[PDB]
Amino acid sequence: QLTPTFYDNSCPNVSNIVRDTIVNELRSDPRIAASILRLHFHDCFVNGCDASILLDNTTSFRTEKDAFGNANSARGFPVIDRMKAAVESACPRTVSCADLLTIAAQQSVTLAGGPSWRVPLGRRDSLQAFLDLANANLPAPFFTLPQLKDSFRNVGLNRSSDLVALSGGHTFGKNQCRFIMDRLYNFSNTGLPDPTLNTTYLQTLRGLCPLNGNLSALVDFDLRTPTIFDNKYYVNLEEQKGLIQSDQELFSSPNATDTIPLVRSFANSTQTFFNAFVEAMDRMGNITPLTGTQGQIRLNCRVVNS
Numbered sequence: 001q002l003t004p005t006f007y008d009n010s011c012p013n014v015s016n017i018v019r020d021t022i023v024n025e026l027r028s029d030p031r032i033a034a035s036i037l038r039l040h041f042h043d044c045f046v047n048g049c050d051a052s053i054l055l056d057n058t059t060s061f062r063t064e065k066d067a068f069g070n071a072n073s074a075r076g077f078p079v080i081d082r083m084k085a086a087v088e089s090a091c092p093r094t095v096s097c098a099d100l101l102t103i104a105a106q107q108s109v110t111l112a113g114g115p116s117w118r119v120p121l122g123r124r125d126s127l128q129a130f131l132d133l134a135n136a137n138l139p140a141p142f143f144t145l146p147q148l149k150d151s152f153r154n155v156g157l158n159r160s161s162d163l164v165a166l167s168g169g170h171t172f173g174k175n176q177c178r179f180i181m182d183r184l185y186n187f188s189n190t191g192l193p194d195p196t197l198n199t200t201y202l203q204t205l206r207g208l209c210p211l212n213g214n215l216s217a218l219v220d221f222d223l224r225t226p227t228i229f230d231n232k233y234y235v236n237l238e239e240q241k242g243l244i245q246s247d248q249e250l251f252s253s254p255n256a257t258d259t260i261p262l263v264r265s266f267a268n269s270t271q272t273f274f275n276a277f278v279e280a281m282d283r284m285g286n287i288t289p290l291t292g293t294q295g296q297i298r299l300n301c302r303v304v305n306s
């Protein structure tokens with residue numbers, strides 16, 4: 001089983017080295033904390049948190065980086081390489097890329113103002129990447145609530161609290177216009193905007209994402225505090241200001257009888273949200289890990305050891 005003290009003897013300063021790397025990177029790229037948290041999410045939803053997403057192409061298997069949910073979207077890979085190199089220097093062949101990414105995600109959340117906790121450790125690295133599985137398992141912004149629930153259950157997260165709390169990752173970070181164009185101009189083939197999108201906010205978003213405009217333009221997930229990890233994400237939902245369809249459905253879907261009270265509870269109390277986020281994060285980080293002698297301790301996160 002995974003344990004928070006896994007490296008307390010072999011690499012006691014691993015978390016500190018990871019933190020320093022992110023602090024430095026944040027000065028030039030304020031979006032990196034959000035990007036790293038997402039990388040961990042995308043790692044865990046595909047064969048578990050085994051650093052499979054970090055592998056590059058080989059002639060025998062395709063990289064998950066070319067999945068619909070990763071291509072021209074996932075980012076921060078060089079930053080992970082940097083901290084890995086620093087950790088390898090401090091503690092040679094000790095910390096797996098899977099664990100490194102998990103610590104990086106937690107430290108990113110904390111640095112952005114979120115809760116602080118010690119993540120379970122002991123994960124090992126995959127011997128292959130899973131592109132098809134990534135295309136099948138990563139949820140999409142246009143998913144209905146039942147589809148979102150299905151996606152989480154598919155990887156082992158049965159609880160609606162898992163879904164509502166982890167969706168809180170959208171309390172910061174960016175989103176491309178491409179993913180909300182339907183909500184703004186032609187939702188579900190009606191030629192009309194998504195009725196669950198606040199009309200005042202609709203105008204603002206249309207100005208940022210005009211029809212026939214730059215689909216790659218970026219917009220903030222949280223209009224209240226764009227880069228701070230807090231519970232404002234849920235306050236937005238209560239006012240019909242969730243950015244993407246999958247955000248707003250947590251509060252407005254006909255199937256939201258179970259998620260609405262969770263959204264409200266997290267919007268009403270930072271402590272309630274933070275506690276639920278840590279609980280859900282650790283549950284996601286516990287998805288089908290390779291442990292013991294399974295897999296390996298990858299030296300270069302981009303390639304399997306040889």
Ligand code: HEM
Pocket residue numbers: 031033034035036037038041072073074075139140141142143148166167169170172173174175176179244246
């Ligand atoms: C519930 C289903 C989810 C859907 C459909 C979804 C969808 C998306 C989409 C469409 C983007 C924008 C990508 C781009 O513009 O390139 C994104 C970004 C992001 N997501 Fe989610 N997401 C989900 C769950 C999560 C979870 C569980 C986390 C983490 C706990 C997460 C963290 C993030 C972060 C932090 C960003 C910003 C990344 C950056 O700015 O680099 N997402 N997500």
Ligand SMILES: [Ca+2]
Pocket residue numbers: 042043044045046047048049050051052053
């Ligand atoms: Ca994985």
Ligand SMILES: [Ca+2]
Pocket residue numbers: 171172222224225226227228229230231232233
């Ligand atoms: Ca925020």
